Design an enzyme around this catalytic site. Structure first.
Site, PDB file in Angstrom:
ATOM      1  N   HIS A  80      66.931 -29.158  40.601  1.00  0.00           N
ATOM      2  CA  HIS A  80      65.812 -28.266  40.316  1.00  0.00           C
ATOM      3  C   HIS A  80      64.490 -29.022  40.244  1.00  0.00           C
ATOM      4  CE1 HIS A  80      63.079 -25.877  37.755  1.00  0.00           C
ATOM      5  NE2 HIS A  80      63.636 -24.839  38.352  1.00  0.00           N
ATOM      6  N   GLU A 126      59.019 -17.973  39.977  1.00  0.00           N
ATOM      7  CA  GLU A 126      60.241 -18.523  39.407  1.00  0.00           C
ATOM      8  C   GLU A 126      61.031 -19.232  40.497  1.00  0.00           C
ATOM      9  OE1 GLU A 126      61.256 -18.768  36.288  1.00  0.00           O
ATOM     10  OE2 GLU A 126      63.037 -19.857  36.965  1.00  0.00           O
ATOM     11  N   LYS A 145      67.238 -13.294  39.481  1.00  0.00           N
ATOM     12  CA  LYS A 145      65.950 -13.784  39.000  1.00  0.00           C
ATOM     13  C   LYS A 145      64.905 -12.675  38.954  1.00  0.00           C
ATOM     14  CE  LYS A 145      67.125 -17.797  37.865  1.00  0.00           C
ATOM     15  NZ  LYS A 145      67.122 -18.138  36.414  1.00  0.00           N
ATOM     16  N   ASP A1104      85.570 -43.861  -5.516  1.00  0.00           N
ATOM     17  CA  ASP A1104      86.236 -43.307  -6.682  1.00  0.00           C
ATOM     18  C   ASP A1104      87.284 -42.291  -6.252  1.00  0.00           C
ATOM     19  OD1 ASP A1104      86.951 -42.435  -9.265  1.00  0.00           O
ATOM     20  OD2 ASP A1104      84.892 -42.654  -9.984  1.00  0.00           O
TER      21      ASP A1104
END
Ligand SMILES: [Mg+2]
Length: 1991
Positions: A80, A126, A145, A1104
RNA sequence: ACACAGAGACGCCCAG
RNA sequence: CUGGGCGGUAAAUGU
RNA sequence: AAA
């Protein structure tokens, strides 16, 4: 490519558009590829770009030959960001900026590129790529998309005016390019080429939540450190060992043989050490043990005396200060030479010095000695010392230099050399410690001084009576009189003038003086003169004292005080020295003594209001505290501290003997003080007394008690609590003390001692198994078994899929971290290669830097995620090859501890491993350091399991453990093996490398230590370590840990303190799990092949641990055999512990019956003891702050912590008085001459954050916070007028007064106006700011973009801004410099009253000037607060008013002494809870309005309503963030955010300890004073008007839960609602019973009309319920879980909703949603989220429905309908309501249709809402209601006991069935029997009604009877169980608060017999003559008379 | 006086 | 032997 | 009925 031309060639019309997708295909021919050499390492991936092949089509011109670097985290999204490299302007914005706010939830979504065009249009593109070859895949990607963005963009553009937007999307694959964006062919071809290069590179190299998961997964997939370099660098770092450990199983035969061998060895040690064989009497055994202890103590004393001077008699004073006690007087300096100064010189050099000193002061020039009030007053409204040079004769200088005032110049001569040689001498134990012995028993400290009339007491009394003006009851006067009596004492006055002297010395600490000159100063009140000779500020300071000797009225008795030189008329004292560290205890002395006196007087049973002579025990404790506080030495603390461990051994049961002679390993050492010798002698005497006989256990009826307890220091016998609190007296010492250079050699001794013996052969360090290991070895098979056992436990509890959930949680926790989280104030080391060798850095200074500077460089470099900075740090560590560590000492209340500062890169590497270890530890059911709830759960719930499984009358056995050297002894390979065992095989390499980097530790040392070390070549000395260190540094001898000429110490073994805390805890958990499995496996077998039944519980922390095992015997002989078997089992642990790396310590106490300690919490059967002295001592450790209000709030926090340890409210009030005295003394009480004017001016105007100290109510002192006291002050005194004016100016109604207004609001609801300027660290802070280089205009940048103060932020400049505002924080950065806070505060307090040192929130003014300005101020405003302003300022004022009105019921000191309650448990009293009507949060509302991100769950209509309400409150608010700043009266959004966030309600929870449990009234009556009841006096007219609803709830409970028929219950409800008056409902979103009661009253009265409208308005549009309810699942002791398949039906904002839910076992989940009309969906979503989180169901469970719908909903977030998970969101009269009453349930049921029941409201009364005040109110109105006619009412309706004739009439009603109106039969008898049984169990008699074997993972010689003779038998005692699990069960009866049968049981017990009743309930026996009278009670018990057999 | 089974400080930099 | 100038450290892992 |  470019975006400008591409956006330019787009034509945008009005509205939204999508264009048309243009399918593109390749045209030009493609060249092959450039060279793409790729390699991967820890730094990143390198992309070497070769030359593109040449072609005529010009393809490939975009790329450039070179190298490209990508970090490992983002390697997954390589296609990408490389295919679309460029074409993006970065600086990614969001839809919140360009589009307006829609509150739809999609605002946080952001696209790739957002372009504001040159003409104003908006274009959003986009990008998307796919590795597919089909056109359908590209079309699917394009459509996805398009659809994931089209709807929100349409909603955003269908509201904004003139919308011209265009949306585009580009899809690029390897086969084609599909996009709606018009692109040229060459762009498509070059994008194709870039995509091909990108996927070739990826093949060669191979929501925010999902992004973080993917980022972390890609990093851990591509991370590869070179194993070979690690193996060549670090020892024992071979992966073959890990593979073998994970491969081969364990050898069971070796385990069996080792277990048998260690078992027989443990049996041999037990039999021979405790004198078991042959047969001996217990007295003979303890006599032999006592003889052995005496011999050991004697030889220790002889060995200590051997290396010492003999010196039987010695003269020394333990207290350096003189015992003078002079009467205070005025501040008038008087020399008054009467006998003449000539009589002074002829008394020694001190006399000569004092005569010459006073002679100069006699000759005028008195200024400097005493301050002039006139000069201070004229300076303030608009530090001079008296220096002098005396004669200083040579002999006088010699004698003074003997004391060390000038010891450097006078070192050479023989007398000083003799003194220096004599100083290095250890005193002898046989020193005849006599004066200390009789000083403690006989002293005059507690005798009243009769001085309660002087000026200091007058001033403190005036201030106290002014502070106590709000509370003017008799109780306050009595407690103030008690405090004044405590103040008027010899010791308190002595401490007062001592603390005045200490404050004067601290003020004069930093005053450089030349040679031969001194300073003389007189104290303010007392006639005491001091001569001060100050050296360097860090070094010593000297002083001498002089008094008139005619003014010393009183003197303390005792010889512990130092000798005083008498010189004629005047009495003088020698020169003593102190440092800065030693001044802390001297300042805090009077408060310490007052606290000790009050604490011990309360603990010894003396009431505060009584007056008695002091006991002998009281004077011992107060004198011991006084002596310990005065001497202030580190060695003295250890002797008192070890008394706890030497005294805990007295509880050990047979067959083990109490053997306290194990503590001789730490009692040895030098003794340099007489007090230490005395304490050692008393400690040895106590040791002998303990070894002589153990503590006696007396099993009385039910309870268990121990006898013979005594105080350790003095042999007086006391109570258990006194001994436990006396164990902690040694905490009365300064925790922080300076370290000198002759010290600090002990640290290196502790470090190197373990490293000396390391096994050279590594075959037993993980490679192979072995028995009897060395000091470092361990066995592999045992580790394998323990890991398998713990894995079995985890798989059993958390299911079979726990590993995948753990992996996801680890990846999520590591993926979201930023660098800004790691940055803090913690220090780091600058040690590097250039500092290793000496003789080149000798003339240099080493310094430590903060982690903030180291992280700022990384932030500005360009990395934000923590997952990006690990590779560089790891590579830098690997190249350096060694972890670099610095050292310093932390002084604590105990032994010294070495602390390891760490490098920045090492810290960065260690953070991830620590996170992984914490995530693994979060699952274990035993470990408690990561599960803080478990430490209060495992111990308390043991009783429940013991009672449930074994049965009644069980016997418990406990053991408490510890570890010798937890930090050392652990070889890191074991930790690495455990961690890799508990991991899913993908983190193995990283964990292995990050552990293997540990074993090259290089620790620096002090450069001054080496500078003094290098000069000397001969060591001398009596210890081998100094010789070894000197010879190793000089190279004379060779050692492995240090080479010649180096500044570092090299080690190889162990882990540092705390660095691997969770991994060590995990290893300890594995060991304890193996121990439990082995214990239960051997418990299945028994003695002579029997079966011992029992339960094993194990709990552990870091080191402990505790093992609790309980068994139930049937007879005597099997009980004794079982106890011997349990003793063997508990003794074998210390021999199984050499296996692994434990090496159990000497402080462990084993095999105790009914006690167990864990993390300083002592359980002694049902009596829980917590040492409150450790919190009373630490009540003055305040912190430096910017305002006085923060000082008062810190005082409040310390007081609350003191109360939570367990203390009476009177003690808390007295401690608060001491805190008030301390604060007023710190505010220049005895250091400034103008304090009298200050208080006389301040009493007119009390004001917090200005000088006044608010004080709490004596009845409820610690529970109430500072805001409650502020509210009381504002509603009581003149503070309300000033607060009203301040808030009015904030509103903007009153303008002007730019500098007078207050804007900054400190935390705690206290708005402030001023802040002090002068900070010592301020110049250092400025230098720190300079060296990091922050931008100057950070406020200017933060006002431009204010949305970063409310979000996580992602931009680099955003991170820089967040860091800049982090550094400029007012509190943390300026306060975490730290130091000795009290001396610096005292030094600054000498001029705070009159000097310009305060800044406004730029003129600097004094405190008196601020008082004058506040006088010409809001005092003339004259207005009060309205309810709106009070509700805004205090968001919980209603709870405040209710608590206050309940509080004034106790006003007189009337009560009765009662037997002390002996069942102490914890509790959680909840008060001041979060309001229900507020319905929102201010910060969340502002964030949601301004930035549109989901913070609060409020719908847009409700958001608009609450915004309108806030706009009504604040006029200058607006939707635009920039408009509010200029219009509002605020300077920056930082100040606005601080002001908004500071004033908001926080819940306040207290955790008191006491008798088990309005509740505030109960806890204020019981806990005011032990053995005393407060006995409140109520007023009838208050409860009817304050909370009339509580009376209604009381009546409703007693009617519905009662012996009435349904018709009678209906009529009673109707008449009770008619009689009482109920306020109108208030609209809430959280369900509430009060609103339902109001709605029910309005419905039955029919006043509101349409009830449905009222219900939907009160619940904010929410109506409905369960159309088909869910069948109930029986829960183990709780409300039945509703499971199955059901439907919720109702209306919600005019929409017919219908919700389908389903659940299985644990919780319900959403299944399907059907909705009538869409309209707006978001309000529906928020409402259904409120309904879901109110009903507890979840949305995370996936749905099986795959059908068509409109949208999807998952996790309360809207999801597109294309996705398949989440719940589908598919879209599909008042006369009918009635009253219906079920069993204990009220419902307004209205059936929708016939065949099912539809209820819409609910109300079930509980056990809480019953009040005796309500019962008394009903008693006053007995004739008003209908309940006054008959006998069952007026007794069951009200709350009262039953009289003799009353219960006789009740019994004759019980005998016959009869018939009475609404009274019923056989149920009234049931509740009567339950009430009588509950009354019976309270008084006694009637008892309260109440596995991972090892196999699947893998005699009689002793007399016994004689060795257990003389011991009580426990199975015949019938002792009850302990723990809160048992206690809470006994209170589970609904009718617990019923007194209807207490007097009946009181009468019956006497007539029947205490044993007779028990025989009656067991055998059914009674005699006739009392049968005639218990027959009514026999019919009350419903036990037939023919069944019971007479005697 | 402080520290310590004798490792240190008891002013430091100058200027004459 | 005088005379002048003063500034330090102190701070570790977790809930 | 309750988390
Ligand atoms: Mg330990």
């Amino acid at each position: 490519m470019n975006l400008e031309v591409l956006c330019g060639r787009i034509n945008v019309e009005n509205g939204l558009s999508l264009g048309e997708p243009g399918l593109y295909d390749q045209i030009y021919d493609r060249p092959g590829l450039p060279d793409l050499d790729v390699t991967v390492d820890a730094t990143g991936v390198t992309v070497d770009i070769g030359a593109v092949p040449d072609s005529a089509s010009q393809l490939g011109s975009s790329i450039n030959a070179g190298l490209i670097t990508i970090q490992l985290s983002e390697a997954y999204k390589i296609n990408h960001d490389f295919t679309f490299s460029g074409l993006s302007k970065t600086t990614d914005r969001r839809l919140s900026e360009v589009f307006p706010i829609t509150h739809d939830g999609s605002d946080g979504m952001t696209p790739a590129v957002i372009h504001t065009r040159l003409d104003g249009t908006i274009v959003v593109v986009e990008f998307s790529t796919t590795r597919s070859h089909n056109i359908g895949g590209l079309e699917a990607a394009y459509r996805t998309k398009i659809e994931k963005y089209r709807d929100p963009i349409s909603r955003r553009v269908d509201i904004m005016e003139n919308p011209r937007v265009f949306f585009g999307v580009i899809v690029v694959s390897s086969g084609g390019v599909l996009s709606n964006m018009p692109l040229t062919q060459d762009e498509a071809e070059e994008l194709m080429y870039r995509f091909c290069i990108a996927n070739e590179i990826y093949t060669k190299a191979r929501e925010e939540e999902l992004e973080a998961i993917s980022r972390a997964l890609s990093f851990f997939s591509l991370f590869e450190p070179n194993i070979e370099r690690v193996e060549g660098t670090f020892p024992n770092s071979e992966i073959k060992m890990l593979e073998q450990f994970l491969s081969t199983p364990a050898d069971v035969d070796f385990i069996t043989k080792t277990l048998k061998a260690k078992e027989v060895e443990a049996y041999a040690d037990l039999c021979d050490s405790h004198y078991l064989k042959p047969e001996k009497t217990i007295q003979e055994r303890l006599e032999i043990n006592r003889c052995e202890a005496i011999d050991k103590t004697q030889d220790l004393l002889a060995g200590l005396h051997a290396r010492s001077n003999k010196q039987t008699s010695l003269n020394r004073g333990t207290v350096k200060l003189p015992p003078w006690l002079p009467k205070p007087s005025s501040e008038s300096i008087d020399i008054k030479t009467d006998s003449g100064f000539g009589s002074l010189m002829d008394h020694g050099a001190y006399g000569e010095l004092w005569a010459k000193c006073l002679l100069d002061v006699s000759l005028g020039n008195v200024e400097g000695v005493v301050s002039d009030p006139a000069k201070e007053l004229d300076i303030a409204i608009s530090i001079t010392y008296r220096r002098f040079k005396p004669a200083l004769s040579s002999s006088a200088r010699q004698e003074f230099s003997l004391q060390g005032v000038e010891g450097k110049k006078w070192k050479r001569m023989a007398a000083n050399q003799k003194k220096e040689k004599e100083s290095h001498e250890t005193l002898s134990p046989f020193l005849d410690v006599e004066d200390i012995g009789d000083f403690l028993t006989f002293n005059n400290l507690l005798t009243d001084s009769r001085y309660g009339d002087e000026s200091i007491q007058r001033a403190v009394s005036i201030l106290l009576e002014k502070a106590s003006a709000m509370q003017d009851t008799e109780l306050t006067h009595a407690l103030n009189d008690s405090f004044k009596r405590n103040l008027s004492s010899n010791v308190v006055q002595w401490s007062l003038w001592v603390s005045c002297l200490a404050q004067e010395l601290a003020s004069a600490l930093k005053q450089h003086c030349r040679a031969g000159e001194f300073i003389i100063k007189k104290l303010k009140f007392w006639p005491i003169y001091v001569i001060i000779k100050p050296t360097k500020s860090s070094s010593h300071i000297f002083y001498s004292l002089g008094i008139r000797k005619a003014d010393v009225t009183r003197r303390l008795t005792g010889r512990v005080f130092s000798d005083t030189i008498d010189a004629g008329e005047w009495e003088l004292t020698e020169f003593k020295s102190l440092k800065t560290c030693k001044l802390t205890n001297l300042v805090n002395l009077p408060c310490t003594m007052l606290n000790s006196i009050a604490f011990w007087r309360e603990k010894l049973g003396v009431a505060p209001w009584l007056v008695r002579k002091p006991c002998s025990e009281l004077r011992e404790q107060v004198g011991l505290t006084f002596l310990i506080s005065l001497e202030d030495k580190s060695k003295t603390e250890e002797i008192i501290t070890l008394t706890r461990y030497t005294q805990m051994e007295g509880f050990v049961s047979p067959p083990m003997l109490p053997k306290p002679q194990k503590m001789l390993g730490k009692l040895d050492g030098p003794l340099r003080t007489k007090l230490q010798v005395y304490l050692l002698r008393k400690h040895l005497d106590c040791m002998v007394r303990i070894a002589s006989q153990p503590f006696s256990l007396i099993p009385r009826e039910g309870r268990v008690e121990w006898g013979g307890t005594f105080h350790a220091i003095s042999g007086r016998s006391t109570n258990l609590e006194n001994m436990v609190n006396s164990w902690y007296i040694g905490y009365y010492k300064n925790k922080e003390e300076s370290t000198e250079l002759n010290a600090l050699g002990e640290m290196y001794k502790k470090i190197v001692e373990m490293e000396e013996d390391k096994p050279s052969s590594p075959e037993f360090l993980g490679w192979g198994d072995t028995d009897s290991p060395k000091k470092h070895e361990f066995s592999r098979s045992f580790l394998r078994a323990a890991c398998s056992s713990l894995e079995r436990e985890i798989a059993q509890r958390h299911g079979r899929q726990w590993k995948q959930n753990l992996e996801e949680r680890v990846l999520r926790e590591i993926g979201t971290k930023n660098i800004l989280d790691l940055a803090s104030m913690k220090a780091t080391s600058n040690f590097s290669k250039d500092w290793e060798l000496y003789s080149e850095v000798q003339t240099k200074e080493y310094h430590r830097s903060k982690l903030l500077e180291k992280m700022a460089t990384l932030i500005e470099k360009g990395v934000m995620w923590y997952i990006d900075a690990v590779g560089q740090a790891w590579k830098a560590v690997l190249d350096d090859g060694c972890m670099r560590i610095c050292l310093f000492k932390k002084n604590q209340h105990g032994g010294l501890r070495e602390i390891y500062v760490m490098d920045a890169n090492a810290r960065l590497v260690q953070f991830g491993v620590e996170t992984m270890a914490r995530c693994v530890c979060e699952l274990s059911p035993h470990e408690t350091v990561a599960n803080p709830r478990l430490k209060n759960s495992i111990i308390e719930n043991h009783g429940l399991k013991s009672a449930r499984s074994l049965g009644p009358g069980s016997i418990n056995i406990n053991s408490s453990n510890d570890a010798k050297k937890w930090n050392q002894g652990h070889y890191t390979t074991k930790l690495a093996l455990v961690l890799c065992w508990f991991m899913p095989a993908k983190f193995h390499r990283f964990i292995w490398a990050a552990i293997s980097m540990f074993r090259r530790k290089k620790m620096m040392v002090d450069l001054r230590f080496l500078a003094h070390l290098s000069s000397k070549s001969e060591s001398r000395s009596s210890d081998p370590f100094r010789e070894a260190m000197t010879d190793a540094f000089h190279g004379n001898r060779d050692v492995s840990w240090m080479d010649k000429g180096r500044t570092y110490i090299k080690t190889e073994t162990g882990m540092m303190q705390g660095i691997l805390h969770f991994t060590s805890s995990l290893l300890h958990s594995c060991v304890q799990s193996f121990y439990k499995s082995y214990f239960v496996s051997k418990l299945k077998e028994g003695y002579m092949g029997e079966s011992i039944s029992g339960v094993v519980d194990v709990i552990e922390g870091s080191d402990d641990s505790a093992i609790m095992i309980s068994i139930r015997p049937k007879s005597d002989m099997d009980e004794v055999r079982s106890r011997f078997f349990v003793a063997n089992l508990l003794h074998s642990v210390k021999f199984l512990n050499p296996l692994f790396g434990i090496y159990s310590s000497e402080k462990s106490t084993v095999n105790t019956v009914y006690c167990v300690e864990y993390n300083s919490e002592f359980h002694f059967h049902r009596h829980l003891v917590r040492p409150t002295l450790r919190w009373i001592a630490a009540s003055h450790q305040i912190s430096e702050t910017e305002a006085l209000a923060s000082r008062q709030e810190d005082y409040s926090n310390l007081l609350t912590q003191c109360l939570e340890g367990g203390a009476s409210f009177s003690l808390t009030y007295l401690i608060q008085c001491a805190q008030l005295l301390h604060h007023y003394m710190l505010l220049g009480l005895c250091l400034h001459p103008l304090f009298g004017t200050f208080m006389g001016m301040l009493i007119s105007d009390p004001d917090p954050a200005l000088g006044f100290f608010l004080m709490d109510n004596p009845a409820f002192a610690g529970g109430a916070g500072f805001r409650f006291n502020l509210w009381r002050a504002c509603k009581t005194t003149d503070l309300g007028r000033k607060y009203a004016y301040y808030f009015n100016e904030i509103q903007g109604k009153t303008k002007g007064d730019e500098d007078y207004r207050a804007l900054d609001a400190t935390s705690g609801g206290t708005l402030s106006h001023s802040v002090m300027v002068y900070w010592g660290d301020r110049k250092k802070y400025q230098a720190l700011l300079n060296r990091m280089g922050l931008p100057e205009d950070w406020v200017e940048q933060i006002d431009e973009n204010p949305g970063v103060l409310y979000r996580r932020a992602a931009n680099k400049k955003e991170l820089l801004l967040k860091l800049a505002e982090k550094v400029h924080s007012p509190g943390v950065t300026s306060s975490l410099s730290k130091g000795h806070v009290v001396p610096r505060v005292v030094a600054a307090g000498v001029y705070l009253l009159s000097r310009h040192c305060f800044r406004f929130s730029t003129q600097k003014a004094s405190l008196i000037k601020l008082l004058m300005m506040s006088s010409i101020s809001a005092m003339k405003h004259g207005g009060s607060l309205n309810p709106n302003q009070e509700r805004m300022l205090f968001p919980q004022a209603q709870e405040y008013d209710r608590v206050c009105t309940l509080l004034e019921e106790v006003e007189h000191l009337t009560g009765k002494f009662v037997v002390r309650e002996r069942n102490i448990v914890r509790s959680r009293i909840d008060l001041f809870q979060e309001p229900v009507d507020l319905r929102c949060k201010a910060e969340d509302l502002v964030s949601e309005v301004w930035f549109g991100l989901k913070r609060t769950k409020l719908g847009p209509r409700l958001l608009k309503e609450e915004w309108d309400k806030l706009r009504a409150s604040f006029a200058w608010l607006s939707t635009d963030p920039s408009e509010t700043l200029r219009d509002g009266p605020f300077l920056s959004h930082v100040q606005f955010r601080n002001f908004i966030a500071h004033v908001d309600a926080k819940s306040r929870s207290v955790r008191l300890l006491g008798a088990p449990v309005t509740t505030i009234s109960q806890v204020v009556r019981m806990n005011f004073f032990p053995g005393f009841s407060l006995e409140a006096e109520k007023s009838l007219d208050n409860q009817e008007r304050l909370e009339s609803i509580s009376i209604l709830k009381h009546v409703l409970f007693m009617v519905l839960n009662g012996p009435y028929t349904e018709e009678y219950k209906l009529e009673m409800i109707i008449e009770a609602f008619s009689t009482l008056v109920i306020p109108q409902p208030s609209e809430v979103i959280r369900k509430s019973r009060t609103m339902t009661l109001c709605l029910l009253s309005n419905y039955l009265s029919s006043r509101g009309g349409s009830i449905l409208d009222q219900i939907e308005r009160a619940q904010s549009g929410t109506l409905g319920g369960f159309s088909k309810p869910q069948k109930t699942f029986v829960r183990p002791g709780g409300g039945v879980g509703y499971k199955g398949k059901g439907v919720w039906t109702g209306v919600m904002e005019d929409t017919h909703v219908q919700i389908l839910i389903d659940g299985d076992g644990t919780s319900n989940w959403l299944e399907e949603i059907r909705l009538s009309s869409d309209a707006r969906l978001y309000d529906v979503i928020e409402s259904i989220r409120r309904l879901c989180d109110d009903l507890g169901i979840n949305n995370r469970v996936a749905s099986a429905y795959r059908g068509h719908c409109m949208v999807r909903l998952s996790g309360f977030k809207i999801k597109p309908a294309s996705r398949t998970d989440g719940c589908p969101v598919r879209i599909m009269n008042p006369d009918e309501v009635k009253m219906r009453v079920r069993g204990d349930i009220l419902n307004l049921s209205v059936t929708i249709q016939e065949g099912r029941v539809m209820n819409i409201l609910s109300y079930r009364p509980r056990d809480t809402d019953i009040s005796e005040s309500a019962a008394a109110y009903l008693w006053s109105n007995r004739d008003l209601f209908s309940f006054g006619k008959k006998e069952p009412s007026c007794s069951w309706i009200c709350l009262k006991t039953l009289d003799n004739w009353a219960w006789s009439h009740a019994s004759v009603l019980l005998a016959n069935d009869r018939k009475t109106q609404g009274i019923d039969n056989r149920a009234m008898g049931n509740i009567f029997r339950d009430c009588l049984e509950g009354s019976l169990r309270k008084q006694g008699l009637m008892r309260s009604k109440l596995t991972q074997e090892l196999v699947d993972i893998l005699e009689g010689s002793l007399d016994i009877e004689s060795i257990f003779d003389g011991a009580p038998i426990l199975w015949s005692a019938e002792v009850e169980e302990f723990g809160e699990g048992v206690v809470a069960v006994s209170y589970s009866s609904k009718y617990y608060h019923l007194t209807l049968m207490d007097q009946a049981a009181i009468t019956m017990c006497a007539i029947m017999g205490k044993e007779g009743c028990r025989g009656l309930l067991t055998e059914k026996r009674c005699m006739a003559a009392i049968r005639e009278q218990v027959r009514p009670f026999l019919i009350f018990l419903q036990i037939p008379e023919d069944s019971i057999s007479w005697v």
